[model samples]
Target: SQELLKDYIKRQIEYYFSVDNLERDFFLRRKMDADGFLPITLIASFHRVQALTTDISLIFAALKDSKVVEIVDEKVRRREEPEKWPLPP
Candidate 1:
């Protein structure tokens, strides 16, 4: 069920990386790279993520268009810059 898995993975990735929770997640924040990108491997290490799939590439592409994050080269990043990141409504 790649389609269902994609939706679930995309939501979870965005959830963890969301502007609403990102600043509060110190542990997840620590995984960010020099460019502020997160390694897809770093994300794949999550228990919940692992519960759904063992395919890193599947998770990688699932997040390709998430409004909260973007993916590239096995890395994930928030779409907005720190200054530009919006406050939660």
Candidate 2:
């Protein structure tokens, strides 16, 4: 289940960036930090890793399974894509 969740979150992040493949962990690290949605603790833990793929997977897994994380993700999505907002009357 954790692996599935990690995969799902990884896909979500990739989709958000509209990338078919993420060549470098630095890109994920930068984007994740800039987004300012996922937990700082998780992000910090991710930053401290020498092997990022596994660390990123675990970080995303932690984020993916949290209600607060979902709320923050939705907020960021709506903010980033204002066209998704309802039209004014």
Candidate 3:
């Protein structure tokens, strides 16, 4: 049961493009201290990247290990992608 969390996360992300239900969101909300949460994020991101043939485990691991991949950070970045990464220097 506990071991299947990773597989569940993987499948949910694949089928719905989200981990926003009892499995993922609930676990993350309550089990914020759990062992595999970061890995779950990494796995989901990796899957999304793989779908586009741009997977990079090293980068994912670096992000995860650094403990800087927060939902708040993502939301802010998504809202200001152009400003954050402007083409002109």
Candidate 4:
């Protein structure tokens, strides 16, 4: 599944633009760190791009490998854990 997803993302990246245009468009449009690294903004933009396209599942699979957000179960568990924490002294 991961291999398939990787290939799909690779194809999509090529379909969208060459490396130079990809870098240029990313910098021109998306938010970046001081050194121009994408960080969280890259993930957020991927989600946005997926929303606009028909291949949501494939795009989401690619994002799963990107390490921007927690897995669904972990995210839900983390949310619940905060509520169970006791107040500080």
Candidate 5:
């Protein structure tokens, strides 16, 4: 689950950060592409080897499963329901 979560977060980061580039490239493109399709364990190990940014990495690790699913659900809700985030509190 950790592996799957990490890879999923990594893909989101890559996708989110790619909006600025006309070619849609990422700094960790190679790793992201190769590891994105691998098993969760492999992705986790691969991430560990190149884990330079803890803030980002830790967030990914923490969000590797349920949180990731929640985020996806939120995105879908926003698209279909068209609601603003946290209307009040």
Candidate 6:
């Protein structure tokens, strides 16, 4: 069953984009485009995501109502600009 599939997908992707949760994430940092948009395939390529499913389309469907993510031009980006987020001390 796809139990929690969409839920899990949306949450993990959001965590990576969360204000204080990024930067130190290593490889995923390079996955972001110059504008901060992440290719859906790249998100789907995350280890956890691959464990659940390989369909990038499923990830898109899961993020349909995200308050923290916006899918534009088939990529995912934070709701606010990166400059709006603060850095830790």
Best by TM-score: 1
Candidate 4 lDDT: 0.38
> For every candidate structure, what is the RMSD over all alpha carbons to the true structure, in angstroms?
4.8, 13.0, 14.1, 12.7, 12.7, 4.0
Expressed as tens digits, the lDDT of each residue in 1-89 for candidate 3 is 42343344334343332322323443333433321233333434544444532333333332332222323321211121212221211
For residues 1-89, write the lDDT of model 2, one tens digit per residue.
65765655544443433322322334443444333343434443443232334454465454454433343532322134323222222
Question: In model 1, what is the error at residue 60, expressed in angstroms?
Answer: 1.4
Q: How well does candidate 1 score on lDDT at residue 48?
A: 87
lDDT of 6 at 52: 76
Clashes per model (N, Cα, C within 3 A) = 0, 0, 0, 0, 1, 0
Task: Evaluate all candidate structures by whole-model CA lDDT and list the values in order.
Answer: 0.77, 0.39, 0.32, 0.38, 0.34, 0.75
* Candidate 1 C-alpha lDDT tens digits along 43-80: 89898899988897788778875888877777778887
By TM-score, is 2 or 5 better? 2
Candidate 6 deviant stretches above 4 angstroms = 1-3, 83-89
RMSD of 4: 12.7
Q: Tens digits of per-residue lDDT for model 5 on 1-89?
A: 65655565555444332324313433323323221221233333445434633444544454444322223311211112222121221
Worst 10 residues of 5 by lDDT: 73-82
Q: Where is model 4 poorest over a 10-residue stretch in terms of lDDT? A: 73-82
Clash total of candidate 1: 0
- The residue pairs found clashing in candidate 4 are none
What TM-score fits each model?
A: 0.82, 0.26, 0.22, 0.32, 0.25, 0.78
Query: Who wins the lDDT comparison?
Result: 1
Error of 1 at 65 (Å): 2.7
Off by over 4 Å in 3: 1-24, 27-36, 40-47, 61-89
The candidate, 2 or 4, that scores higher on lDDT is 2
Measured with C-alpha atoms, the lDDT of residue 16 in candidate 4 is 32
